[PDB]
Write a protein that holds these residues in place. Structure first.
Motif, PDB file in Angstrom:
ATOM      1  N   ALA B  46       0.671  -1.245  -0.031  1.00  0.00           N
ATOM      2  CA  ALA B  46       0.126   0.022   0.077  1.00  0.00           C
ATOM      3  C   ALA B  46       0.827   1.223   0.038  1.00  0.00           C
ATOM      4  N   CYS B  47       1.958   1.246   0.698  1.00  0.00           N
ATOM      5  CA  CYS B  47       2.802   2.334   1.119  1.00  0.00           C
ATOM      6  C   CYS B  47       4.154   2.468   0.009  1.00  0.00           C
ATOM      7  N   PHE B  83       6.842   5.551   9.210  1.00  0.00           N
ATOM      8  CA  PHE B  83       5.861   6.521   8.474  1.00  0.00           C
ATOM      9  C   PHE B  83       4.760   5.909   7.718  1.00  0.00           C
ATOM     10  N   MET B  84       4.668   4.726   7.383  1.00  0.00           N
ATOM     11  CA  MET B  84       3.712   3.867   6.718  1.00  0.00           C
ATOM     12  C   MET B  84       2.640   3.294   7.779  1.00  0.00           C
ATOM     13  N   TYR B  85       2.990   3.057   9.098  1.00  0.00           N
ATOM     14  CA  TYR B  85       1.873   2.910  10.098  1.00  0.00           C
ATOM     15  C   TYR B  85       1.481   4.184  10.818  1.00  0.00           C
ATOM     16  N   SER B  87       1.728   7.721   9.458  1.00  0.00           N
ATOM     17  CA  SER B  87       1.591   8.935   8.449  1.00  0.00           C
ATOM     18  C   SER B  87       2.493   9.979   8.847  1.00  0.00           C
ATOM     19  N   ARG B  88       3.245   9.969   9.691  1.00  0.00           N
ATOM     20  CA  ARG B  88       4.474  10.782  10.213  1.00  0.00           C
ATOM     21  C   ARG B  88       5.731  10.522   9.747  1.00  0.00           C
ATOM     22  N   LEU B  89       6.229  11.492   9.188  1.00  0.00           N
ATOM     23  CA  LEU B  89       7.680  11.398   8.566  1.00  0.00           C
ATOM     24  C   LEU B  89       8.604  12.094   9.234  1.00  0.00           C
ATOM     25  N   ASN B  90       9.721  11.533   9.986  1.00  0.00           N
ATOM     26  CA  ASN B  90      10.648  12.173  10.623  1.00  0.00           C
ATOM     27  C   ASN B  90      11.811  12.606   9.881  1.00  0.00           C
ATOM     28  N   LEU B  91      11.768  13.638   9.017  1.00  0.00           N
ATOM     29  CA  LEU B  91      12.987  14.359   8.285  1.00  0.00           C
ATOM     30  C   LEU B  91      13.438  15.628   8.853  1.00  0.00           C
ATOM     31  N   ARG B  92      14.890  15.230   8.967  1.00  0.00           N
ATOM     32  CA  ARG B  92      15.560  16.368   9.461  1.00  0.00           C
ATOM     33  C   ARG B  92      16.949  16.203   8.761  1.00  0.00           C
ATOM     34  N   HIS B 110       5.864   9.882  -3.786  1.00  0.00           N
ATOM     35  CA  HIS B 110       5.200  11.250  -2.636  1.00  0.00           C
ATOM     36  C   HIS B 110       6.265  11.409  -1.746  1.00  0.00           C
ATOM     37  N   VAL B 111       7.173  10.401  -1.170  1.00  0.00           N
ATOM     38  CA  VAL B 111       7.911  10.908   0.006  1.00  0.00           C
ATOM     39  C   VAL B 111       9.360  11.438  -0.604  1.00  0.00           C
ATOM     40  N   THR B 114       8.386  15.094  -1.241  1.00  0.00           N
ATOM     41  CA  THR B 114       8.396  15.837  -0.173  1.00  0.00           C
ATOM     42  C   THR B 114      10.172  16.151   0.466  1.00  0.00           C
ATOM     43  N   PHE B 118      11.528  19.671   0.997  1.00  0.00           N
ATOM     44  CA  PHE B 118      12.577  19.723   2.172  1.00  0.00           C
ATOM     45  C   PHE B 118      13.900  20.644   1.864  1.00  0.00           C
TER      46      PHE B 118
END
Ligand SMILES: CNC(=O)COc1cc2cc(Nc3nc(N4C[C@H](C)C[C@H](C)C4)ncc3Cl)ccc2n(C)c1=O
Ligand SMILES: CNC(=O)COc1cc2cc(Nc3nc(N4C[C@H](C)C[C@H](C)C4)ncc3Cl)ccc2n(C)c1=O
Lengths: 122, 122
Positions: B46-47, B83-85, B87-92, B110-111, B114, B118
């Motif tokens: 799915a992701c 992120f898959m479970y 919907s929050r992506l930890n991008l730093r 889509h990742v 983003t 970033f």
């Protein structure tokens, strides 16, 4: 802290519905009276209290076929199964009672709560 | 026509994450270098485009263990699996490159989009 993807969860549910439609990784058959419905065990547990209670138990976790009571309305279960994969509930005056009774049996408290609000407004 | 439940999809994803955390119906082990990650095959498809392409194939559908390339960053895959479970992506700035490269390999367009936005903003 973390970037929030607002439409990710809806996109996951849509893809799970596409897999269910194409019979990919559907590990359970739900038998309602004479009608058969193929779904994913994980999706059933996530939206239903009855299916959660059944599949958490290791004696019933590997069950390929789940036989529900013949008193359960086939159209009522179909509307609720569709809702689980689409987040859209088809509630109308002709099916309100059949959906409410099935949601009670499947232990879908928030659906019962909306069924409570439906006949209160109509 | 149909009643829309706005927070249903997010509630389903949260419950799927609870099942993954409790190891309920997790049918696959993802091996990244030396690190192991247990997940649901349906959530992966799915992701991720890579996991969709692998599990649609009947030769690889029943595979209990999926061995990814040792070049793949374990922390990069962990952030993407989380992120898959959730919907929050930890991008730093310290992980942007590791996440972008892993998202490209896993075919998460889509990742990548983003990740593109970033470093353009930072
Ligand atoms: C519109 N949406 C609805 O109608 C959904 O309604 C319902 C969904 C529902 C799901 C489950 N499944 C799980 N429940 C937990 N936990 C339980 C929580 C009470 C506490 C939490 C820590 C774990 N975890 C993992 C799953 Cl898969 C159990 C009972 C449920 N009941 C009683 C519902 O009424
Ligand atoms: C933030 N979110 C992301 O990054 C998610 O990104 C991606 C998710 C993704 C999922 C799948 N999986 C499925 N794809 C279909 N269809 C394909 C569509 C192009 C056409 C449609 C009819 C069927 N069905 C069922 C699944 Cl499970 C395939 C490719 C994917 N790719 C390339 C992604 O980039």
């Amino acid at each position: 802290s973390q970037i929030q993807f607002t439409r990710h969860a809806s996109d996951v549910l849509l893809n799970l519905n596409r897999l269910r439609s194409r019979d990919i990784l559907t590990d359970v058959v739900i038998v309602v009276s004479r009608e058969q419905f193929r779904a994913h065990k994980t999706v059933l547990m996530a939206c239903s209290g009855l299916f959660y209670s059944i599949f958490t138990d290791q004696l019933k976790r590997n069950l390929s076929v789940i036989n529900l009571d013949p008193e359960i309305n086939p159209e009522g279960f179909n509307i609720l199964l569709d809702f689980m994969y689409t987040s859209r509930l088809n509630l109308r005056e002709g099916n309100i009672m059949a959906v409410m009774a099935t949601a009670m049996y499947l232990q879908m408290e928030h659906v019962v709560d909306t069924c409570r609000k439906f006949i209160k407004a109509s």
